[PDB]
Every structure is written in C-alpha cells, then in structure tokens.
Amino acid sequence: QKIHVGPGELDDYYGFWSGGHQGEVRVLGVPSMRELMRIPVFNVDSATGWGLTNESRHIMGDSAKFLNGDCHHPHISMTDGKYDGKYLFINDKANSRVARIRLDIMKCDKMITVPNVQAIHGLRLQKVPHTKYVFANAEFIIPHPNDGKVFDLQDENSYTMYNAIDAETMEMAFQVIVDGNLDNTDADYTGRFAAATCYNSEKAFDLGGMMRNERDWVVVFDIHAVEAAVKAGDFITLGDSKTPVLDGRKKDGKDSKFTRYVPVPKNPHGCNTSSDGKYFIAAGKLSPTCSMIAIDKLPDLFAGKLADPRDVIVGEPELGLGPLHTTFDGRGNAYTTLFIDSQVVKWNMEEAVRAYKGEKVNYIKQKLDVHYQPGHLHASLCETNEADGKWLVALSKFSKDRFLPVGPLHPENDQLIDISGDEMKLVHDGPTFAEPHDCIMARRDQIKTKKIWDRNDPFFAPTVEMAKKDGINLDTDNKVIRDGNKVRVYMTSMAPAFGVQEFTVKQGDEVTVTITNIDQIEDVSHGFVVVNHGVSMEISPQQTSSITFVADKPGLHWYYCSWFCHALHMEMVGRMMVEPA
Amino acid sequence: QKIHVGPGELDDYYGFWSGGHQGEVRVLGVPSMRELMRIPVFNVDSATGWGLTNESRHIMGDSAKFLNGDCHHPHISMTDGKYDGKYLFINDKANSRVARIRLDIMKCDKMITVPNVQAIHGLRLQKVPHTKYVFANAEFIIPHPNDGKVFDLQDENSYTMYNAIDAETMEMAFQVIVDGNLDNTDADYTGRFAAATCYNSEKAFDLGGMMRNERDWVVVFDIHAVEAAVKAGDFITLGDSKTPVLDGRKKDGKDSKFTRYVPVPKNPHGCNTSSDGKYFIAAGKLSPTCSMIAIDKLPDLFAGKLADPRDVIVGEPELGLGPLHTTFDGRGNAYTTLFIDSQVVKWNMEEAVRAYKGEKVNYIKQKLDVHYQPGHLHASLCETNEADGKWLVALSKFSKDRFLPVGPLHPENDQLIDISGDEMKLVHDGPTFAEPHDCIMARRDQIKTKKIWDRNDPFFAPTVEMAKKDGINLDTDNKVIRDGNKVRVYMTSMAPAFGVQEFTVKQGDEVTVTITNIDQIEDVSHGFVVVNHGVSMEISPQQTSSITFVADKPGLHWYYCSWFCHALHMEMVGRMMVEPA
Numbered sequence A, B: 001q002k003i004h005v006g007p008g009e010l011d012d013y014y015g016f017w018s019g020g021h022q023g024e025v026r027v028l029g030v031p032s033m034r035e036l037m038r039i040p041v042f043n044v045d046s047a048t049g050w051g052l053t054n055e056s057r058h059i060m061g062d063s064a065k066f067l068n069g070d071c072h073h074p075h076i077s078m079t080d081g082k083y084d085g086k087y088l089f090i091n092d093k094a095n096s097r098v099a100r101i102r103l104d105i106m107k108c109d110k111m112i113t114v115p116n117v118q119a120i121h122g123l124r125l126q127k128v129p130h131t132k133y134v135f136a137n138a139e140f141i142i143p144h145p146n147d148g149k150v151f152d153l154q155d156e157n158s159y160t161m162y163n164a165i166d167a168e169t170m171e172m173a174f175q176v177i178v179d180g181n182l183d184n185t186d187a188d189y190t191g192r193f194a195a196a197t198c199y200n201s202e203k204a205f206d207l208g209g210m211m212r213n214e215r216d217w218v219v220v221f222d223i224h225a226v227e228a229a230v231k232a233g234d235f236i237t238l239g240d241s242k243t244p245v246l247d248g249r250k251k252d253g254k255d256s257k258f259t260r261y262v263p264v265p266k267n268p269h270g271c272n273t274s275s276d277g278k279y280f281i282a283a284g285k286l287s288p289t290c291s292m293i294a295i296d297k298l299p300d301l302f303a304g305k306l307a308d309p310r311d312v313i314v315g316e317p318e319l320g321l322g323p324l325h326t327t328f329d330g331r332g333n334a335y336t337t338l339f340i341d342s343q344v345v346k347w348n349m350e351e352a353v354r355a356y357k358g359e360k361v362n363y364i365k366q367k368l369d370v371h372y373q374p375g376h377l378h379a380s381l382c383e384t385n386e387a388d389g390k391w392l393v394a395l396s397k398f399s400k401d402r403f404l405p406v407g408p409l410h411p412e413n414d415q416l417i418d419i420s421g422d423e424m425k426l427v428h429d430g431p432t433f434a435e436p437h438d439c440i441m442a443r444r445d446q447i448k449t450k451k452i453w454d455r456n457d458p459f460f461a462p463t464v465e466m467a468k469k470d471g472i473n474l475d476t477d478n479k480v481i482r483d484g485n486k487v488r489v490y491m492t493s494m495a496p497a498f499g500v501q502e503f504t505v506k507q508g509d510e511v512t513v514t515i516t517n518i519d520q521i522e523d524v525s526h527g528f529v530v531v532n533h534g535v536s537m538e539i540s541p542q543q544t545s546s547i548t549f550v551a552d553k554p555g556l557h558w559y560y561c562s563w564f565c566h567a568l569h570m571e572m573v574g575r576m577m578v579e580p581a
C-alpha cells in the first residue's frame, strides 16, 4: 500500500490531530503525515489573532482570559454510525472546556466552560442515529459546593460528574453524578448506552492509594433513562447553574436507574466501542488485559434480569504489559497499545470471547514493536461502521533516538502502520510537538471545505450586526466613527492596499478596527499588525475580522499587512496618528 | 540523491524555519522535511509555558505583555565565515525585537526590544572574524521624538536606523541613521562592510509615492569607521536610550563617512552575499534584475577614489519578473526566486559580470517552475564559505491545489529542490503554517545539543538565586515558604510523583511554584498544570521551572503532570487547598 505522496499528488485521508498541551488542532494529510493546517482553539495564535480578535474572544467568552489548553480527544460528528463531516469536538483538560470546530471553514466556532467540574478529559460523540450529544468525562473529584469549607474527598458532596452537551446548540444538556472518577469514554451504536472508565474508585490522592483495590469499574449509562427523568422534571441543580443534574451514584448498594458499575482491573484507561458495535472494550493498564462488555447484555443488566454486574463481561484477554487503548480494522480484529511492552498487539475479538468460555484458542495474531511507549492508536474510520482496515497510527510518547537530537525536550513519535493485509507493517515515523494524544482520520470525500468565506457566515454575524448600528456597509465602506473615547474604524482591504491608509485618534482612545477582505481569488489572505501595540489578525477572502486595542502611545504608529498577498505586499501599510495628552 | 528517510534512519541536515506571523522557530529534519521541534519565541506556548513561566517572562522583559510576533529571518552564528552552531538569531517585525536561541538547548535565552525604531525586519550576522554583531533593519520611517507633535515623514528628524547588537551580551552596540528606509541586509567576509536594501528612498506613505524613483539603493556601511567613532565618543543619544547613534544620512549632497548609497532599481528586496565573498546581490523586485556590487571596489568607494557610486555595480543581469531573493551553490551559480514568473532561475555569476561588460554570453542556465509565487529561497550552507551545492528550499506563498483543501486559509508551500547536479529537480512539497519567510540549513555535525540540563545552566540561574536566599536546595527540597501573602512552593519531580502533593493557602495569596526535574533518564519530561487557573509549564530532565499565579478561587484545586512520563502518569497529581477570605 501507498506510503509516498509526491509533488502534485494529494493525500487520501484527512487526519485531525490533538495538539495536546499546546492547545490547537492540527490538520494532516494521510499517508504523507504532513501538517496541512493548524486550527487554534485553546491556544492564542499570533498569526490569525485567535485569542486577540473580538470574534475569537466572543467565542471563548470568559475563558478568553486563559492562554492555555490541554486537548486530547478529537472526534467527528456522525449520522447513523458514519462520519457526516459537519463538526469536530475536542476536550480541554487544563481549563475544563469543550470546543467545536466547523469542518467547512476549519475554525473553532463554539466553546463552553463545563460548570461545577474540574478537568474535562475523556470525550466521545453519540454515534446513532446521529450526534445529538457530546459526552465528556470530568476527571477529578471535587466538593459541592467548592467554597473552601470542605477539602476531603469523602464527603457526601465530594464527587465528579459525567457531562452531556447539545452538539448543535453547544449548551449543557445534563450531568450525572458518579462514584469514583472518570478517565475515557465511548458510545454504542443505538444511542441508548454510553460507558466510561474509572481509575480512582478509592478516592485517594496519593499513588499507592489509587492503586489500592484489585478492581475499579467501567460505569455504563442509560441515556434513555437519563433523558426520561430530565423531561419528567426529576433533576437537581448546583449553584447558579441551570443544568439538570441526576444522581448516578449507588445509594445503599442499590443502583440508580441511570447507571451500572462493572468491575474491571486495574486502573483501566482506554474505553472503545468496536466497529461492529458488539463491545465496550476497556484497556486494563495495570492489568495486562482488556475487558470486553457485551452491549448485547446491557438491556438485561438495567432491567434486573442479570444476576451479577460481571455477567456482561464476555471477554478478558491476556495481552501484555501495560494496555492503554484499543482500535479496530473492521475485519473482526482489535489492536491494542501496550505501553510497558512498547507494542501494538493485534487480536481477534470473537476468539477472545470463546477463550473466556473455556475453549483454548490463540486469539493473539501479532505484536509489533513501536518506538517507544505507545499511548493512543487509531485505525482509519474505526469509530464508524465503515472501519476500512487500511491505516493505523500509534502515538508514542518517547522518541528517544528515532529522530535527530533537538535538545533535552524531545518530540513524540506518531507511527504510520499499514494494516490492510495480514501483517502490520511500520512505514513512517512522524515527529510531532507537545504530545498529541489521540487523532481521527476521515476519507478525503468525507470532508467538504469552503474555498472562500460567505458574507452571511455566523462566525462574524455579530460583527455584521454591530456594523448595522453604525450605518456601515461592510462590503463597500471605508469610514471612521467617533463615539466619546471609542473610535471604530471600518475598512475593506484589497491586495495590495488597505481601504483606510491613515486615521487620527487622541491618546487613550479605544480603537476597534474592522477589516473586510473583498478579494475574490482564493488564497489571497491579508493580515493586519499594529507595530509595538500587540495587535495581529488574519482576514481571508470575503471574511470580516475585528480587533480592539488602546492607543496609549502618542505619535506616528505604522500598521502593515502580515500575509504575503501580492508583489507590492511590503508597501501594504497605513498610519495611525495619535494626538498627545 | 537521497529524499526518503524511512523509520530508524536519520536526516542529514537540521533546518531552522521562521514561524512567520505565528512567532516561533521550528526545527526540521532535512531532507525528510518533518518538524522535529517548535521553539517558542514571540508566541505564547501553552505546552512549555513560554510567556507564562518566570524564566521566560524575565528574558522577554517588558514585552511579556505582547502575545504576538512576526518573524522572517533565522540566522546561525559564524566563526571565520563558517557556522559555529552556538546561537540562532531572529527578528520580530510586529513588536520590534531581536531574539537569541541557544542551539545547545534549543530555547530562546535572550531578547531585546530595539529602542527608537519601528518594525525589525531584515537581519543578518557578521561572518568574519565571527558573529560579534547581529545586524538588524528598522523598516519604518518615524518622527524623533515620536511625541505626537510632528507626523511628517519629510521632516528633518523623521528617519529610521540601521541596528547593531552585541551577539554575546545582547545589548545594543550602536545605531546608524540613514536616508530612505531599510528592507533586507547582509555582511561581507571581512567584517568591514555590511549592506542593506531600500525601497522607500522617496520617504512617501502612499503606494505610488514609494514607486516613484526609477532607483532606490543599497546603502553600504563601513562598520570599522562606525566602531572607530563610537570608540572616540563621537555620537549622540536619543530620548532615554544610552545607545550610541551615528549619522549616515547625506548632508547637502555629500556622503557621511559611515555610509555609501549605490543606486539600484527598483524597490529592491533581497540583499545577499555570495559565498566566495565577492558580491552583495540585491534583488530588483520591480526591475526584472539583480544588481551585483563588488565588495572589492568598496574600499576605493569609501576612500573617495571612484567618481560615481554606480562604479561598484559590476553586473546587472536581466532575469525575469519579480526577483526577490538570491542564494548560492558554492559552484559559481546563483539562484533567484522570481515571484511573478513563479520560478527559481539558476544563473552563472561571473558570466553575468562578463555580460555587463558587453561580452556576448548566456548566463541563465535553468528556470524551474515553482508553486506558487516564491519569496525567499535557501541553499544548504549558502551563508558560509562552505556552501555545498546539495539542497535548496524555495518558500512559495500560494499553495493553491498542491495539498488538500483545508478551508479559506491555505498553507505555504516550501519546496525542496535537488541542486547537486546541473539540473535542479523538484523533490518534495512541504506544507507549512503561518508563512515562514526564510530558513537555514546546517549539517548534522554542525549542531551539538544537550541530552539533559546542567544544574548550573544560565537559563534558570536567576531562579536558582532566589532559592539560595530562601535557604533552599533545589536538588532535594520539598518545602513551602511563606512571606506575607506570598507563598513559594519548592518541589522536586520524579515520575510518577510530584515531591509536593498538597499545600494549603489563603484566598488572594500570590503562589509561586518552583519545580526541579530530578529524573536522570533522557526524554523523561514533566509538566505542571493548575486546573482552571490558566497555568501550564514543562520541566525537562534536570531543569528548574517556576510560574506565578493568584489563588483567587477558594476550594480544592487539582494540579497534574501534563507530559506523559510513566505508566502511572495519569496519577501524577497534587492538590491546592485554598482557604476562604
């Protein structure tokens, strides 16, 4: 298969990389493994002005004060268990957020701070009949209220929560209180069930105390029950938050209607739904195994027909030292990362089930050495019923000597593996910055992007609305509006000239600058930088962007186009003149 | 020649790419073209905490308030016209800075805001006897003083200055006032001469005005005469800066003794020194030519022994539409990007010289189509007397359809070209983000990097000093110092545990957390994030990192390791308990 993309040839798949604790999303071409684009999200991007513009800061809301993010789990919206390519969602563990990226423009359009929780980690989307909810794990246990009166993790009100978000409105939909904590999560192929791993059933704070008892669990949710109760008004609220909260904790050994707890060894990590939709598969981490829950048997468990929690475990294969995550070729094989053994193991699921039932069958097919310490892995289309079994990417955390030395801080090794035949084969070592955790691949024909902006696009619709209240036609106008100590500059730009090449303000004015790029030709991007004022933004064809800063320095202040747009780019400039105190 | 670096194999050259409007430096492996490392400079990096940590904010000084940058020009320190691999220097156009990167650790360790100027653009290094000076261009004509009383560019005190920075101290050495402006810059192979291009000899603000003269110039500097006047104390100062300022403007049609103006058509851009040391080659931009100045004839120019300044023009080859930059194979050939024709033109320098003298000779050897609109280009070791004629990179501004569509905003196309033979062969298209302008390549053996940090390292030496005053040994100690409402947490880190897992503070307290990574294994990096407090940093092996934040939120707040470092990495956590006000 494939491997090389030469000049003039295009990649076959889009890859979407989490940027880890750097905070952006990266778009790659597969199988080239080249970075086609970065999409700023939780990071401040000096290039495009994400974090600086009024459009981005409005999207970010109050959290625009944060300059950091820690994002792990990128996922694409689905319709009937197949990517629809409309949105990508990603977590922020550092500042408790979920972001939405529109895949038609490759920008983040919505962001939410998840209320009453700490650290949003695991995240996956509802598969069937479409992505109605985004499900997100809050990883750390906290007091409720968290007012500094209680610090102890054991209080009746010290807990973490599972989170559902309307994928379309990006509002909170509901939250479910749970025993222990939450690591990773996945959803079934019906919409009824979701599931999550827990590694802190002990509720300790030290290393040894989290590794305490030989088993934790995966908690299985009945979204249908949860939906029913919310619409039956049976919910509580926490603090000033209107979010419906339902209780998924076990009372005195009795179950809530919303949850079930399936014991799993040992500090389990990855939580993955097979492409055939037969299994939730939990990676054992400290246990050298994975754990297979039959989704089949979940209706009987919730209905009380099953004698005991462990009954839904139809497989528990022994695999190797330090299992972290599982993915699927859609051929009936599963692929699991072993962190300690530094391998990917390929294994047959149905054979694992039968071996848990007595039959002595060798369910392991192959172990491939990786370099080194793999975390996540992802097979192409693995999260859909179209799992095509062509490509595998394992994302290792130590690169050691796989690339040229670049100092004490090392890159990550993301390795492309061909799985289209019977033997896994390593084809490409891909260095990446700041620890991507997971990634997702889509077919090229599953993504459809806009070549230039629509004037009516929601992204800057608020800026269009404000322009109205000044009597500005953004498509045509080059005006300066004065309002007390607020100066609002409106201009069109067309390579190689700004529509407004000079304005004059008085010292201390609040200057907003709105730019509308009216070039027709694709790729004709402009920038705008105000020298020595900390101001920078992109404006792409037919886009409107706006930025606001204080003219606190008297004298002549130059602004220049940052994006190379024309032969006369260097001369694409203007002057802001600031009248003294 | 080469091209593919399969798994386990290593690249041959380091590349150091500008990060453009994004503000960072990127280290790539050549010829694979993979990005090995991002070095944060003018950008805020959520991953390492550059812009957030105390060590980084100290280096940046007052400019820490700025979240943006605009770099174009990365260069490597030399000894005897050869790379010595100690330092990389780069410009910031947006906020008028010069930054230093230490190539042993791959971090920015020094940063200066250039006084009394706007927009640091062109930048190159003294070649011989070594890089004592960093030369830097200030692009924009501004009033002095810029107090808001005078705005006119024609005014006797409206001008810009050429800048010299001590490469070692990173303190201003001197500035030189010039007529017109400055675009790009380069230096000879003796240390006496430096030269810069000008496109605004007209001192205009509009587009037509800047294009009025048929010729602008390259201004040439006698650095030795300059140095001899600073020494003699024949200099002025401006405003609050101590920096010696010399006058290299013309006075009533008579030269300053520090400078010469050599008229060159038209809005010239590139300013490149051939690797044999013979020529400053200015790229003609609006004129379809390069102009070759003979560094030979310069001593006579400054000794007044030549009637006209054009007498130092020895070749002015017609090459094609929109020449922007020039590079060298060390074989006698120059290679020039044609922005409008979208080509690299290979030409023989000495034949161009023969042609200028009327001799009938075809100095053009080849034109290679590039995709699309090339700005800068770079041939391996081209800045040294060791120019090796092997690889070339052309950095084109419009990628169009060369990669998959990723929205209205496109990647740049940096195309690797094989120049080892008579024929340039296009070998790889490399999509890049936020428009790197230029780059530089060095042989693998020319870069030596630290595998781990030294405890004595200058980078965190100030943080070490604060610890001594506190009677704190960083290598061993896990104590919590209190001083009023200041709280100074000192801890060691060893995967999988922070040496301080808990600390209590009062609401409103100023918390400084100082972490020393005492793991000995290479590549074992640690991280430190405080949830919902916008705090994030990296501590690589044997490093000390510190960060400061306010505990304005009462309650329990978790802090965790961000770098996946150990099997139990998820459990590398701690607790900040904050008592109410």
Ligand code: CUA
Binding pocket: A495, A496, A497, A525, A526, A527, A561, A562, A563, A564, A565, A566, A569, A570, A572
């Ligand atoms: Cu407009 Cu560069």
Ligand code: CUA
Binding pocket: B495, B496, B497, B525, B526, B527, B561, B562, B563, B564, B565, B566, B569, B570, B572
């Ligand atoms: Cu230390 Cu992960």
Ligand SMILES: [Ca+2]
Binding pocket: A199, A200, A201, A202, A210, A211, A212, A213, A215, A216, A266, A267
């Ligand atoms: Ca446990």
Ligand SMILES: [Ca+2]
Binding pocket: B199, B200, B201, B202, B209, B210, B211, B212, B213, B215, B216, B266, B267
């Ligand atoms: Ca001119």
Ligand SMILES: [Cl-]
Binding pocket: A184, A185, A269, A270, A271, A272, A325
């Ligand atoms: Cl998972």
Ligand SMILES: [Cl-]
Binding pocket: B184, B185, B269, B270, B271, B272, B325
């Ligand atoms: Cl140049």
Ligand SMILES: [K+]
Binding pocket: A397, A398, A399, A410, A411, A412, A435, B523, B525, B563, B564
């Ligand atoms: K790593």
Ligand SMILES: [K+]
Binding pocket: A523, A525, A563, A564, B397, B398, B399, B410, B411, B412, B435
């Ligand atoms: K571009």
